[PDB]
Design an enzyme around this catalytic site. Sequence first.
Site, PDB file in Angstrom:
ATOM      1  N   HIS A   1      -3.033   1.639   6.569  1.00  0.00           N
ATOM      2  CA  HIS A   1      -3.354   1.559   5.153  1.00  0.00           C
ATOM      3  C   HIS A   1      -3.454   2.967   4.590  1.00  0.00           C
ATOM      4  O   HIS A   1      -3.850   3.904   5.288  1.00  0.00           O
ATOM      5  CB  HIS A   1      -4.663   0.800   4.914  1.00  0.00           C
ATOM      6  CG  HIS A   1      -4.854   0.368   3.494  1.00  0.00           C
ATOM      7  ND1 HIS A   1      -4.215  -0.730   2.960  1.00  0.00           N
ATOM      8  CD2 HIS A   1      -5.602   0.891   2.494  1.00  0.00           C
ATOM      9  CE1 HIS A   1      -4.565  -0.868   1.694  1.00  0.00           C
ATOM     10  NE2 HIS A   1      -5.406   0.103   1.386  1.00  0.00           N
TER      11      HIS A   1
ATOM     12  N   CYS B   1       0.824  -1.207   0.000  1.00  0.00           N
ATOM     13  CA  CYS B   1       0.000   0.000   0.000  1.00  0.00           C
ATOM     14  C   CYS B   1       0.861   1.261   0.000  1.00  0.00           C
ATOM     15  O   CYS B   1       0.651   2.164  -0.817  1.00  0.00           O
ATOM     16  CB  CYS B   1      -0.972  -0.007   1.187  1.00  0.00           C
ATOM     17  SG  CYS B   1      -0.245  -0.091   2.846  1.00  0.00           S
TER      18      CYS B   1
ATOM     19  N   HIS C   1      -5.505   1.824  -4.948  1.00  0.00           N
ATOM     20  CA  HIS C   1      -4.582   1.326  -3.937  1.00  0.00           C
ATOM     21  C   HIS C   1      -4.101  -0.073  -4.280  1.00  0.00           C
ATOM     22  O   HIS C   1      -4.691  -0.779  -5.103  1.00  0.00           O
ATOM     23  CB  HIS C   1      -5.224   1.325  -2.542  1.00  0.00           C
ATOM     24  CG  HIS C   1      -6.435   0.450  -2.424  1.00  0.00           C
ATOM     25  ND1 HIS C   1      -6.914   0.010  -1.209  1.00  0.00           N
ATOM     26  CD2 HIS C   1      -7.270  -0.059  -3.362  1.00  0.00           C
ATOM     27  CE1 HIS C   1      -7.990  -0.734  -1.403  1.00  0.00           C
ATOM     28  NE2 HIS C   1      -8.227  -0.790  -2.701  1.00  0.00           N
TER      29      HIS C   1
END
Length: 117
Positions: free
Chosen positions: A81, A30, A93
């Site tokens: 995240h 991420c 993402h």
Amino acid sequence: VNGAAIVAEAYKYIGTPYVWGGKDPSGFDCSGFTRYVYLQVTGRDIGGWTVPQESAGTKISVSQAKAGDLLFWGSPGGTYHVAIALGGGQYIHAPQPGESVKVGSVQWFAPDFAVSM
């Protein structure tokens, strides 16, 4: 160097497989994905993992996130995240070890805050 450019650069890596700690187009996690996009467009190095990237701009609500801003899950200091805002409740993402770089909606998984850049 508007958010449209960040979005256009991020779209280039759709389908890139997830790799834990990956920082280049052979595999992203991420934070590596967002760092790579910002490195390509702006040349500056926002953090290599999730938490330093919380300092790269000004904290803001997810409602006030424009295309290109960063979106963070978790609390400040403990984000787990990050994604790139597309505007309109959408982001892009590297989702998780299962999946490759893709689009997502806040109606699926809502981020906790955002960061203007």
